Swiss-Prot record, chain B:
Quaternary structure (record): Homodimer.
Gene, per the UniProt record: serC
GO cellular component terms given for this protein: cytoplasm
Assigned keywords, A-Z: Amino-acid biosynthesis, Aminotransferase, Cytoplasm, Pyridoxal phosphate, Serine biosynthesis, Transferase
GO molecular function term, any single one: O-phospho-L-serine:2-oxoglutarate aminotransferase activity
Organism from which the protein derives: Alkalihalobacillus alcalophilus (Bacillus alcalophilus)
Cofactor note: Binds 1 pyridoxal phosphate per subunit.
Positions with a binding annotation for L-glutamate: R42
Cofactor(s) listed in the protein's UniProt record: pyridoxal 5'-phosphate
The protein, known as: Phosphoserine aminotransferase
Amino acid sequence: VKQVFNFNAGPSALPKPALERAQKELLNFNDTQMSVMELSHRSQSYEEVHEQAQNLLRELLQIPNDYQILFLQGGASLQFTMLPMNLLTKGTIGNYVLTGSWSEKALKEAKLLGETHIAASTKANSYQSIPDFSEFQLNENDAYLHITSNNTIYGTQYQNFPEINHAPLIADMSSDILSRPLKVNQFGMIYAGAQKNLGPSGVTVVIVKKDLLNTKVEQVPTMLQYATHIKSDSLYNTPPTFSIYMLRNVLDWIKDLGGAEAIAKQNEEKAKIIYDTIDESNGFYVGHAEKGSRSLMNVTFNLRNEELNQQFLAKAKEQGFVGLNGHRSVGGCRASIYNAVPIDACIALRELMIQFKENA
Amino acid sequence: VKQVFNFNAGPSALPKPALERAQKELLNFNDTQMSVMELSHRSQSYEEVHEQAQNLLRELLQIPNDYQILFLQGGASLQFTMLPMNLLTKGTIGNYVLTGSWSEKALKEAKLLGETHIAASTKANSYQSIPDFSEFQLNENDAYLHITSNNTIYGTQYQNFPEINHAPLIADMSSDILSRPLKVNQFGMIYAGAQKNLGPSGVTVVIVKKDLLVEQVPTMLQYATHIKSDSLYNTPPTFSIYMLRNVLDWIKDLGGAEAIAKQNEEKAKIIYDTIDESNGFYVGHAEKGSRSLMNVTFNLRNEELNQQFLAKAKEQGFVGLNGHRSVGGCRASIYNAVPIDACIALRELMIQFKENA
Ligand SMILES: *Cc1c(COP(=O)(O)O)cnc(C)c1O
Ligand SMILES: *Cc1c(COP(=O)(O)O)cnc(C)c1O
Ligand SMILES: [Cl-]
Ligand SMILES: [Cl-]
Ligand SMILES: [Cl-]
Ligand SMILES: [Cl-]
Ligand SMILES: [Mg+2]
Ligand SMILES: [Mg+2]
Ligand SMILES: [Mg+2]
Ligand SMILES: [Mg+2]
């Protein structure tokens, strides 16, 4: 077989055992002689999958008992509007920390619904770093403080999270959820599209402190209330059953390999392969991120000019690498190295990078 | 070994060829050595599938060029709010025809957002029929007229559709889309969750007259966002759209919408003839002139017998026959991919149960 190295940024590589499991039972799930895709969401077989996906997330992230796990449709992008629709009430402020383009998109949706503020930002310097928490400008009437833990386009990531007492801390963790241990009780809400570290596209995981969001909000459509989904255990309407089943299968693989602590060790090792290659290149490759903010999930870099960027990306494509072109808004290169990307893909990328440099 | 007959009401049976195809290439789609689930949605590999799904829908339903085909998340239930959010503007009315519970759920969401009206309703007679179109109460300032083509819980279905000129006709076709030919030009918008006739759950198809379709609406909740971006504004439900493509290829291979309608008419006939020849042992909920070809609703003469029948069916491998909780009785869902042999098996079980009663 031709060699293929999957560095896609979203959707992305899945752990092969989760896919092989799904393949084997695609036509006959749990001895029912039906696919999981053909079952009722009120069947015992599906209810067991739904519940197991929650229980695995709870165990793996050590989610406290006063938080609920929601499985919603619409992507992280729908959460950009659902969050302020539920929490940005008259007289309060949706306060945002801007660390990339995804932060900006979240802010934009809140501005349509109420007052907003920028607590801190590295926009002026093209999002090369996470701002120091001492810079954060907080308001007594903040409805929440929103952060983006991993800035997928820019290749930067929070190393730790601020202690916020005056309003709930909310995080878009789409591109680094369950890549490392997390202290969930620092947050009022965490959300993530599944299609980077958890599963395929079509479900969004929302971890919510129940008493923050379990109350009706007057005038919000039924489907757009967190309370609807909390009360119905994410079964208010028909869920994305195959996406939640695949999420379950991915979480079983994370657990089998040793959980969040083990996957962080793996992720640190594979990121270091690529960062060391950059750092050893005497400026032939230049990372976008400041070293103290380097993402473990998305490695962003450029060559010395756009002609070399093009030549490198063309060679990479010829050699079987998929997905390395930077996001269209910024150019350059982006190696996405989510949980399931194998370490031999990273070794292969290092070898490509060394050879291209030496032959230039 | 075990015989299983899948009469689930949603999600539901899929075509064996579509599932077998998906299984075979689950790890290696189109020689990429990746699953379709592992592709970027901005890849040519995914974009080809996305476009093919749209193209097959256009071909099979004969959707004119002045309509757009959207693939959205959130189910039909999110459309209950997204439609009025976009079209129910100040001074206009969201006018509803009530033919079942799903019609009521749609009306409920419009009421939160603006003025609503009931053009006609068969609620008072327990939704046994579709109202005569001459009874429709229409308003000059209607933003739209909303119908539910197939009333999934009640087992009734529009035989044809009204000619509406004063405002766009909008239909929740979740439980009968692409079960028969349609004249799409009758409508301003059609929507359907995929999980009955088109594919697995997680994608919703919206067919919209492009000139139909907003200040202050969130980006994700504007139809315009998805029209302009070809349903690629954010990450789509890629596997669900791939499966939709596979289902549409199966429909096309069987001869299209007329061929599927003939199959569906034959399946429904088996069940209704069994009811009608039963000397009152089985009774349909629907008036004969409004009977659905998609969901056949019926009861036995008392609740103990209903429970006995449903227990026997479950024992013999039938899945999904319990009626919706809100009405009780029995419901045989016979969407496109439910095979005729399952309908024959249900008949034979119904005849034996009556004989042994
Ligand atoms: C990809 C991405 C999103 C958008 O997710 P969708 O599921 O496409 O709406 C939001 N936030 C981050 C950090 C992302 O990487
Ligand atoms: C099942 C159904 C719905 C609800 O669909 P979801 O995808 O669960 O939101 C709406 N309308 C009809 C006619 C249905 O049958
Ligand atoms: Cl970003
Ligand atoms: Cl991105
Ligand atoms: Cl109904
Ligand atoms: Cl239903
Ligand atoms: Mg295990
Ligand atoms: Mg290997
Ligand atoms: Mg009826
Ligand atoms: Mg006859």
